[PDB]
Amino acid sequence: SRIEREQHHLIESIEKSTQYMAKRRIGALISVARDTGMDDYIETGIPLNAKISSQLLINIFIPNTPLHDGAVIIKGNEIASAASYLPLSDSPFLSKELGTRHRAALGISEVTDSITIVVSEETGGISLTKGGELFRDVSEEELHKILLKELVT
Ligand SMILES: Cc1cncnc1N
Ligand SMILES: [Cl-]
């Protein structure tokens, strides 16, 4: 179909699912592939090759469920995999109060041009990684403008 419609639907799906999980302190880790490949990391997860929806993203990350423990990787117009491994950053600049999801999101951002979104299960804050930088606890307006700029081409 039309690319721009899928991209805006992707953005709305992330905004809606992360708002839902943030409110309930459900951790999440969602990495959006771009030009650089996430293919090897997709292979580490459970293959879904599913249509993107906020409902599916929420169901994946329910705690103590088969699909929740690891990253979701979106590729093109599909949720490609759940429970994928991402490389963990060894950076000592990452705050010690952040968890493995953040360290994983930082690590993939150091070696891909992917955009990765984290929901902390400790605080509910939403964070974002790109190019080896972390944007910690962004507002809904900040998240919206970042995703517009980064995911709509
Ligand atoms: C430990 C871990 C958790 N989630 C994603 N990647 C990882 N390496
Ligand atoms: Cl967390």
From Swiss-Prot:
Homodimer, required for active site formation. ATP binds at residues 69, 86, 99-102, 120-122. It comes from Listeria monocytogenes serovar 1/2a (strain ATCC BAA-679 / EGD-e). GO terms for cellular component: plasma membrane. The chain holds residues 103 to 255 of 273 of the full protein. It is a multi-pass membrane protein. This is Diadenylate cyclase. Its cofactor is Co(2+). Belongs to the adenylate cyclase family. DacA/CdaA subfamily. Changing residue 100 to N: No c-di-AMP formation (construct without residues 1-80). The keyword Cell membrane applies. It is found in: Cell membrane. It catalyses: 2 ATP = 3',3'-c-di-AMP + 2 diphosphate.
